[PDB]
Amino acid sequence: KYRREAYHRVFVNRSLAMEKIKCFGFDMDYTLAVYKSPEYESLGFELTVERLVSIGYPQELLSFAYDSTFPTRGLVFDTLYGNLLKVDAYGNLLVCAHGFNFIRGPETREQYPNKFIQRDDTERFYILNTLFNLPETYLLACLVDFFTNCPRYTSCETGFKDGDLFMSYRSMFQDVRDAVDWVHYKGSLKEKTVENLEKYVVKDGKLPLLLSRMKEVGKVFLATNSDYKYTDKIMTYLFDFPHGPKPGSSHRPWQSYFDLILVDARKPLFFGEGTVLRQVDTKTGKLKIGTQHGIVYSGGSSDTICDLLGAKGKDILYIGDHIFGDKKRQGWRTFLVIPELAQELHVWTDKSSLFEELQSLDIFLAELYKHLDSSSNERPDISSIQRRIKKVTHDMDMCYGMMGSLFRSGSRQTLFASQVMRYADLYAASFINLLYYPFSYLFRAAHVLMPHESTVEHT
Amino acid sequence: KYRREAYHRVFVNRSLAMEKIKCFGFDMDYTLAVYKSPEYESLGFELTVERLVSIGYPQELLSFAYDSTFPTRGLVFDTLYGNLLKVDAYGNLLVCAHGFNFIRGPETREQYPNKFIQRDDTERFYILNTLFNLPETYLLACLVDFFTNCPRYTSCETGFKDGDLFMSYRSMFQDVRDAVDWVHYKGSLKEKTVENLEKYVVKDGKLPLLLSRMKEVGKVFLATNSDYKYTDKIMTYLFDFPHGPKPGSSHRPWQSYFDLILVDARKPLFFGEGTVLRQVDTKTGKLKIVYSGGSSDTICDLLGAKGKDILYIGDHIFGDILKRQGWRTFLVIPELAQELHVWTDKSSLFEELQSLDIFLAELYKHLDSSSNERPDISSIQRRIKKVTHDMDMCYGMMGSLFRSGSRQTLFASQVMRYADLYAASFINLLYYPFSYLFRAAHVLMPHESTVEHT
Amino acid sequence: KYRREAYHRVFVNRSLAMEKIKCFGFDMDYTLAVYKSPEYESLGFELTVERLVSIGYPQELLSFAYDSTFPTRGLVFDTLYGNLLKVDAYGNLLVCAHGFNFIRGPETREQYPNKFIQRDDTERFYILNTLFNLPETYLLACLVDFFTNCPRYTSCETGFKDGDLFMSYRSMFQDVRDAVDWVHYKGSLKEKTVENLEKYVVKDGKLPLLLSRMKEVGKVFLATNSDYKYTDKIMTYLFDFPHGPKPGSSHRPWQSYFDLILVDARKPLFFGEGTVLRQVDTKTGKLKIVYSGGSSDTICDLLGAKGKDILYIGDHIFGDILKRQGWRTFLVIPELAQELHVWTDKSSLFEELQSLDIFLAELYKHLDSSSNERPDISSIQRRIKKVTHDMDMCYGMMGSLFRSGSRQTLFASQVMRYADLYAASFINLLYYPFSYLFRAAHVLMPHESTVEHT
Amino acid sequence: KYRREAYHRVFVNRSLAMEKIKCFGFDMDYTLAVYKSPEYESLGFELTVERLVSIGYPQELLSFAYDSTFPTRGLVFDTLYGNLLKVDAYGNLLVCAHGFNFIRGPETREQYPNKFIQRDDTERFYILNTLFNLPETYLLACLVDFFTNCPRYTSCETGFKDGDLFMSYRSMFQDVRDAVDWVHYKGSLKEKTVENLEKYVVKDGKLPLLLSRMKEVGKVFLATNSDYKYTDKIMTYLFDFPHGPKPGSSHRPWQSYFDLILVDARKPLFFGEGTVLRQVDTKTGKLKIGTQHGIVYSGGSSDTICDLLGAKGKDILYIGDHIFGDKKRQGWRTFLVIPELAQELHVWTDKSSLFEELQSLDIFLAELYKHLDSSSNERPDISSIQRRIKKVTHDMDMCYGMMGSLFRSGSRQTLFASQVMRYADLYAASFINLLYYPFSYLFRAAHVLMPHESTVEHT
Ligand SMILES: O=C(Nc1ncnc2nc[nH]c12)c1cccc(-c2cccc(-n3cccc3)c2)c1
Ligand SMILES: O=C(Nc1ncnc2nc[nH]c12)c1cccc(-c2cccc(-n3cccc3)c2)c1
Ligand SMILES: [Mg+2]
Ligand SMILES: [Mg+2]
Numbered sequence A, D: 001k002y003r004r005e006a007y008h009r010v011f012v013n014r015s016l017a018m019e020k021i022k023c024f025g026f027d028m029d030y031t032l033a034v035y036k037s038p039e040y041e042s043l044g045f046e047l048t049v050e051r052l053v054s055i056g057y058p059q060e061l062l063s064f065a066y067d068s069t070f071p072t073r074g075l076v077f078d079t080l081y082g083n084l085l086k087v088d089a090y091g092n093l094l095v096c097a098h099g100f101n102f103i104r105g106p107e108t109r110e111q112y113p114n115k116f117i118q119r120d121d122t123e124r125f126y127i128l129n130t131l132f133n134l135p136e137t138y139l140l141a142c143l144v145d146f147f148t149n150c151p152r153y154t155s156c157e158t159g160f161k162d163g164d165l166f167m168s169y170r171s172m173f174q175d176v177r178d179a180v181d182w183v184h185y186k187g188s189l190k191e192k193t194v195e196n197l198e199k200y201v202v203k204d205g206k207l208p209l210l211l212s213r214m215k216e217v218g219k220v221f222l223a224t225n226s227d228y229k230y231t232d233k234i235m236t237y238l239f240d241f242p243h244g245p246k247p248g249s250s251h252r253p254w255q256s257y258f259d260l261i262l263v264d265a266r267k268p269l270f271f272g273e274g275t276v277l278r279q280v281d282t283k284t285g286k287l288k289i290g291t292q293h294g295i296v297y298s299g300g301s302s303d304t305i306c307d308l309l310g311a312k313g314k315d316i317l318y319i320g321d322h323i324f325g326d327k328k329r330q331g332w333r334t335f336l337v338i339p340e341l342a343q344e345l346h347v348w349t350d351k352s353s354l355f356e357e358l359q360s361l362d363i364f365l366a367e368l369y370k371h372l373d374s375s376s377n378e379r380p381d382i383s384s385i386q387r388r389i390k391k392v393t394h395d396m397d398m399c400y401g402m403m404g405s406l407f408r409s410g411s412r413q414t415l416f417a418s419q420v421m422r423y424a425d426l427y428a429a430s431f432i433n434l435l436y437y438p439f440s441y442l443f444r445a446a447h448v449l450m451p452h453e454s455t456v457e458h459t
Numbered sequence B, C: 001k002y003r004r005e006a007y008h009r010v011f012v013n014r015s016l017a018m019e020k021i022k023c024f025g026f027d028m029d030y031t032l033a034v035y036k037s038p039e040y041e042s043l044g045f046e047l048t049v050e051r052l053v054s055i056g057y058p059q060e061l062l063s064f065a066y067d068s069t070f071p072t073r074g075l076v077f078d079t080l081y082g083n084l085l086k087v088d089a090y091g092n093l094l095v096c097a098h099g100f101n102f103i104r105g106p107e108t109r110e111q112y113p114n115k116f117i118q119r120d121d122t123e124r125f126y127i128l129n130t131l132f133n134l135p136e137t138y139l140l141a142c143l144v145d146f147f148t149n150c151p152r153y154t155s156c157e158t159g160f161k162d163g164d165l166f167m168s169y170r171s172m173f174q175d176v177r178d179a180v181d182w183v184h185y186k187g188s189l190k191e192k193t194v195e196n197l198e199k200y201v202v203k204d205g206k207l208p209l210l211l212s213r214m215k216e217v218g219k220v221f222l223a224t225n226s227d228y229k230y231t232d233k234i235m236t237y238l239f240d241f242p243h244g245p246k247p248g249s250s251h252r253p254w255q256s257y258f259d260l261i262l263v264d265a266r267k268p269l270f271f272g273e274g275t276v277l278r279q280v281d282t283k284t285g286k287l288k289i290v291y292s293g294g295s296s297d298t299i300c301d302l303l304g305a306k307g308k309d310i311l312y313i314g315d316h317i318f319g320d321i322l323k324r325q326g327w328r329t330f331l332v333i334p335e336l337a338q339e340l341h342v343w344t345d346k347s348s349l350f351e352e353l354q355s356l357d358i359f360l361a362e363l364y365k366h367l368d369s370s371s372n373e374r375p376d377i378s379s380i381q382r383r384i385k386k387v388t389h390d391m392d393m394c395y396g397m398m399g400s401l402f403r404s405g406s407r408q409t410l411f412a413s414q415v416m417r418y419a420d421l422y423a424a425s426f427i428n429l430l431y432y433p434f435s436y437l438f439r440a441a442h443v444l445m446p447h448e449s450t451v452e453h454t
């Protein structure tokens, strides 16, 4: 079968006939505006720590340096015991780190009977789903680690004797959860991003090319959480080239690429009741009191966008980096951006050696038990080649980072995997990969197989 | 790679070293006592209709004959609109039948906005999950079909009017839900089973052979909901052969094969705090070795094993957490036999879908977003639908237990949530040693299944 | 101030100028056809038990005799815990009875945290609002009492076990809810009523006198849910006197008293979009002046009146908004007769509570927050409870329709929401002219009722 | 029967045995801190208007002067048609003003079929329940009035052609709803309050006297929304006298009057899940990282307060100005402060003349129909004495303000009345009236009567 280059590919969960697509909707942040890594994370990290020190946290936090190789997106923070968990779709603990100490084996079972947690017990647990969470993911580990191994702090099961009244992990977590919020909303993050954009934000002439082609076969819109003056800056930079879509072409304003531009969207509330629809003054950012087609909207709702565009769910492909939830309404189609996927395809490809040795070691196992059944009392020693497995699974796991792959730990899918398969029709490392497909393309679901399907042939 | 004969195989969701397994636990009904099909379903049907009629339903119900080729296990009755729904893992409608009238495409979303139901709404939606539900699955659709297509009745969205008296589908359902219960508990289902077990229960010498081999390497217990007079009848029959485990040997009573036998389990309550531990007068068939009631916890205490040491073998999918560490599970799915026969004997269909997919790929290969080219594929897009429809109807009118085309079923997801192991019968354990290392087969995402390691 | 005899009086929630009233609309059942008490309730009871028994309930149900002194209208069946609750306007528990066992004080909040239920939870709580509910109000408590107090059964929180078969209170309730419906619609309640109307329906020459006087000053219509063969039977009997309106005059058929007669109303649906307008063959007693089905809107069109011009007289409390302007209402509350007799004949109790309250005031008069003085009042605090209990039991075992001591009932609040006027019977209109100005009596708050204008 | 002076009285909805009360809980704002009227309202009003002008509203708003005689607390703003409604418990329109124009009669019925509204249709309607709402209550009327009678604005059914793109009443309302919020939370209201406290806040030596007596018979606590530095200032001023509880006594700190002090309460969330319990640094306001009895708490929950005080709902009388809603939990008793009640008791008392003439005019009516029944065709003309009624009800109504009494319009109770009877065990113009009762007092419910109870004697 013909398949496009791995790194160009759009992966299909549910089938989608692209000619039926009439509108393309865009998330801005971490979608069109992909923030550079490790650098944007570091900026968030440093600003969050600066903010915690200012409210009374110890100075030793300033020596923390962000480390991209620790966090994996989507971990669960247990505010009761101060643990970052990696769990599967159903609640089962895959990985459990206290600070930088990885527990596993029997010792985890003392703290988590049945190696299981109630994911729907919010504000005991906290799911760190988004790309903005990577900083505080690593920070919490640092914090738990520091206070654990600092002699003037006594470690309790649910927190610390800090000096000496009590700081619970739950209080420490809110402390962190507020700092990040503060940094995004009142601190100098957006500010420092904007003042050196070439350091923090990616740009590629492929973005205007792709959008322009979309506007030829359908309508295009923007629905972002960010305000207008932040959006005007970020988009102006994304489209700053000495030309328009193609080389030689005249440069066009970034506004000219959208039939509808909406800011202050308030997602997820946007997709339900929403807020009241406003309009924005291009000249000032400040909202117009009252509410031609060169217009910029504020607030509003999903439903409104369809009414203005003259469309309906089915007709709309919504492109972004965020996984939502859940009717009625009317039910937009979905493209999901997962930047980690560029790294994971390199492991899947450039680390074949490991996958092959696993496959063969597994093969070999099947041979040992070939002429064997319940009658047979032969207990072939397999501890030797068991060991080589755990540990090549460890090595393979560790190519993805210290908390492993985004989508799986060994055999098991992660909770993050299941939600991606819930939420997304289409996915890839970036929407740009759309460039490589015609707009008449028929995306066929890549069928997912149960054991009795995957390992039984049609012969 | 070496793989045992498909019909003998034991499939693996999560890895399991069998040598670690110290006790083997057994469900009885539809595990050790596999009830014959279609005859046992039919009996439950007839008895349930006869009961309904006895409390005022029309005579025309008596000319209903159970039809095994309609019901697929795991469907959802929407008590609001009277529909039988086949949904996916997340609540997406795959299949909607009002009576025997299959609906959607356009006409669903009249009734189900975003072709979606929020699966957890208990008062409206009822998952027909068990093998004992197959009868009422068929009966329910029969009833709605009848009242729709009968001049005596006027049909509303939420029910039908029985001339001046409204009858909601929700109320119709609870009559059907009660009749079945009555028939199992107050009525003569259990009785008419026992009076001709040859017609109603499977038996095979493999079952005592297997349980004998298990008792050599571990402990073995029975944990059933049924009572003792019924259990003794059933277990006695299952073990009635002119010999013991192997040919030649003396026959032994069925009890001899179990270290612990427990009845009146009241699962799922069994698995939580349970009921008080009683024991049973073998003689009286009454209270008050043979235990009654009790707890999951109690079993562990008595057997002197706990948790990961226990392999629970049965036909029922449970839930929740397991404080207190929970058992490993082997799950019986009788439908799996027939479904493997489609997977192997209908390969000509699979291969053709494969060819049509290969072809599509080739039409679009030299094409990107620069291209204006609209290939017409509607011919291909048509045959793919007929083959995919044809393929689905090999499994019956409501399709496969585990999927509809693309999409997995909510059932499939429950199976993968709950079961370490699964097969059409537990008996297939016979073909593996007790030192075996069951290694989880491995469930790939699009980007894993459709790109290679080179 | 001049006020008519209490038993003749028509009470006013909202003001109403009668001269503005152009049409008078009538409910039939329990409005014009007041069914005799306790004999009609008993019949419904016996028929409903006999029906339950016919579908498998124990014989002991047949030795139940309906008892009018237990049920008070407006109680709430909690289908979860099997309790009959008397709550206030906002959902506060006033009275909790499991079977015939009255509960609270301490033991409620075991079951009802904050002695509170969220009244709008339809699937759990069922308001027994109508006069036809009185039978099943008593029956329900009987049933729970029986199954609790019977060695055959084991009682759980959510139900009782019928030996191996669980029976939830919720399932018990829907059996009871269905039996009543069956008895009204499929069974012989309507039939056994018609065969001896002398025993089962009140009649009085005042009814034709009143309706004749109404037709002089406005239009008059009938809007009932019952059919025509039943309506003709009932209306014919109500009007069977050897004369017309006044003594001396010729008798006239009952239809002659109405400008418009409508059956099969299907209220409340009647008041919304309704059903298609049919008319009835007087002869056949069948379709297809006498109308059938239709709409609230249609009545207005045909009568050429609309809304505030119409006074709807009935025994049923409705709801919602009324787009389209809605009618004014007169509400029949038969219980009001008996309740007025307590209010007048038991004045010795009221006066004594008044004296005990006066006394308490005097004990605390010279006292403020500066004072250390704890008067003991527990003797007084005791007798106030016995008199207040004694007073409440004058209205039956479940107290007044409208209140428990301090607190008003959710029923009282519905009455005040829905009804412009109310009385024990509509007949009391007879004592007012059609130029009358009904002026709303006036509902005071603590600071208005307990401080004076000087 | 003996009753205390009207203006000293605590009015009883549901009975309450005061000896059973073990803890007294306090709201601060508009409870202990009663803000002076008309002056605090004016300050809110001016700051809100200054804020609307700054974001683009016309300068003519600056000439608006707050007018205490217009608003009545608890009105409903219809964002669809721009109307302030006064409704009853069940939804029925009692009063309807577009700006300063009062509709009534037939004309209202065109816009509100059945003279009825769905109160549970939020963000069409908005209930202005709180004392902080009085400013924006009057403001909305002004705004609707101004734009209506300003020649360069065209009046639409749902808004205005302002200049000329559209400003809906719904957009104008949010505009207002944000200004007030902004003024409270980011603007100079708290600021300007604090800098001249004797102008804006009441003080009375009765407050320390009463509290001190409460601390002798039970425990006392504070649970306010305001922050610590705002609370420290407001309370310090409330207790600034040259003495403690009684004359001659030594002055004590305001902290010494509470066993538990809690700020940042986040009501109503406080009464459910709450937030995490923190502690505050008395020296800085800034929260302590970690968490003796001289302590000040932050955040937390209802449940926590009981645990710390060692009590349970039944035992706790909660005193404040706000009406909440609604289990489980554990169900505090309730004292509700309604400052308007001091004015309304003056009408009830000093305007008897009107009540008497009504009563007599009503008497006279009953005479006319005395010897009359359905037989009688006498239609006595009563239009003359009908008129004198509507209009003495109008005069009586108008003694309370242009939108009438807080608790009723003519015969009918307001929606505000019903909620007070829902929510409150005890009520009065101020909690201070507790001073006049012993702590052994038995408050007896003042029974509420239906027509057949109120106008039938026991003879
Ligand atoms: O996450 C991504 N984001 C980005 N990808 C492409 N365009 C982007 N505009 C903003 N963010 C984008 C990512 C994912 C995979 C490949 C890449 C990429 C990055 C740099 C250069 C290129 N490239 C150069 C020639 C062809 C492709 C490809 C980028
Ligand atoms: O809303 C009120 N609030 C206030 N009432 C009493 N003390 C307060 N501390 C803060 N706010 C209070 C109000 C309600 C009714 C009467 C009054 C009051 C006001 C001023 C002086 C007095 N007074 C003087 C002698 C006796 C009473 C009484 C006040
Ligand atoms: Mg984003
Ligand atoms: Mg079973």
Ligand SMILES: [Mg+2]
Binding pocket: C027, C028, C029, C030, C031, C314, C315, C316
């Ligand atoms: Mg009726």
Ligand SMILES: [Mg+2]
Binding pocket: D027, D028, D029, D030, D031, D320, D321, D322
């Ligand atoms: Mg307050």
